[PDB]
């Protein structure tokens, strides 16, 4: 019965603009101050910047200082936030978020949010790096091996090994999204020590968005 | 941003009660009210507790806040897995002259058992040497409930610099995992006697260490 609906998130390259909307209803909205609140991928909220009731007022973190500007329209109901120089640290989700002050600090009404993420990386096939033997007096216990994925966009690459012959013992993690904008992750397979000395483990790492397949042995090291 | 010092991950068993805390100093907490945010999982935040000890009509009386001093703590009785969620705790810094919350609490619901880390921690590869560039690869596996804290060690100082580290997903076995990355120049790996990966789960810590030779 009442809501703010962002809008405007996209994919932005470093140096770039954006322009962020919210949509708002079920009040008179000018009668509310408003707030920007963002939420890096997987860290915790950051306050961005606010503006008053009367419209004319505007507050920023020092982070976003002079590279980026509150604004809103009362007559249609609608908060802005123009995002100047957008740099990596920027990519998160964008909330607006209806602030009230009574007493004390709190932002009683939020949106869905709105991505937006600063990219310098486009479409990049990965590099694969042999993973350490790791016979660190592991003795007769499982001793593993790998494959490291390191810096492919975008997602996502798949890992066999021997072709897919071995599938039992295998672990192949989520990616990261690295401060580059580049995506990392690794597939280790647990085989008997003994086994090494006769036993060869080749890892196939498939990327389809870069048509990239590289087969890649691994056994111990010197 | 983690302005606000909040714990990572509290845990309980469904009907039970949980507090999280939030430490602050005089500049936030001390002389201004706290409030608290209920981040479902892809979700938004929502306002859960606002002005210390206040909820908003349609949030439930299981729900409730104190605070003194340089502190603020929730309560939340009557535990059920729809709370299961990240909990964040605002207020407003004068010194910073900005709107601060904690770096976000994890709540997990206890319905499986929980289940100690197994870290694996491979080193740069000779390979990756050569290519002038050295990555630490930190595996953590097989745990519940799915929150870890990953600390990192060049020798025995602490680096929190060069490292991504992933959000805890279930594999196929119904357990938690995540990976954490250290980039470091060929120079550094070299220069320091050992690195070490430290995972601190719930209120125990496994660390996994390597040396170049």
């Known amino acids: 019965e009442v809501q703010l609906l962002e809008s405007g998130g996209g994919l932005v390259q470093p140096g770039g603009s954006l322009r962020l909307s919210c949509a708002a209803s079920?009040?008179?909205?000018?009668?509310?101050?408003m707030s920007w609140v963002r939420q890096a991928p997987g860290k915790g909220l950051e306050w961005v910047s606010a503006i008053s009731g009367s419209g004319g007022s505007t507050y920023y973190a020092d982070s976003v200082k002079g590279r980026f500007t509150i604004s809103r329209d009362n007559s249609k109901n609608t908060l802005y936030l123009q995002m100047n120089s957008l740099r990596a640290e920027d990519t998160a989700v964008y909330y607006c978020?209806?602030?009230?002050?009574?007493?004390?600090?709190?932002?009683?009404?939020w949106g869905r949010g709105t991505l937006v993420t600063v990219s310098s990386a486009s479409t990049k096939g990965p590099s694969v790096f042999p993973l350490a033997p790791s016979s660190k007096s592991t003795s007769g216990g499982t001793a593993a091996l790998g494959c490291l994925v390191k810096d492919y966009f975008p997602e996502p690459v798949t890992v066999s090994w021997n072709s897919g012959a071995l599938t039992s013992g295998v672990h192949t993690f989520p990616a990261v999204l690295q401060s580059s904008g580049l995506y990392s992750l690794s597939s280790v397979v647990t085989v008997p020590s003994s086994s090494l000395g006769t036993q060869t483990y080749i890892c196939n790492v498939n990327h389809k968005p870069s048509n990239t397949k590289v087969d890649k042995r691994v056994e111990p090291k010197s | 941003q983690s302005v606000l010092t909040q714990p990572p991950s509290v845990s309980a068993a469904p009907g039970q009660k949980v507090t999280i805390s939030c430490s602050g100093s005089?500049?936030?907490?001390?002389?201004?009210?706290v409030s608290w945010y209920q981040q479902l999982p892809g979700t938004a935040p929502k306002l859960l507790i606002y002005d210390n000890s206040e909820r908003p009509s349609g949030i439930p009386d299981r729900f409730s806040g104190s605070k003194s001093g340089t502190s603020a703590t929730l309560g939340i009785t009557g535990l059920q897995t729809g709370d299961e969620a990240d909990y964040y705790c605002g207020t407003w810094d004068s010194s910073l002259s900005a709107l601060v919350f904690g770096g976000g609490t994890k709540l997990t619901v206890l319905g499986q058992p929980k289940a100690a880390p197994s870290v694996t921690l491979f080193p740069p590869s000779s390979e990756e040497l050569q290519a002038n560039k050295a990555t630490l690869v930190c595996l953590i596996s097989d745990f519940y409930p799915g929150a870890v804290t990953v600390a990192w060690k060049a020798d025995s100082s602490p680096v929190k610099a060069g490292v991504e580290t992933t959000t805890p997903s279930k594999q196929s076995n119904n357990k938690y995992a995540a990976s954490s990355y250290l980039s470091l120049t060929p120079e550094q790996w070299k220069s320091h006697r050992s690195y070490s990966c430290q995972v601190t789960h719930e209120g125990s810590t496994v660390e996994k260490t390597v040396a170049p030779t």
């Open positions: 005089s500049s936030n907490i001390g002389n201004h009210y």
């Open positions: 079920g009040f008179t909205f000018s009668s509310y101050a």
């Open positions: 978020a209806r602030l009230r002050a009574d007493l004390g600090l709190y932002m009683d009404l």
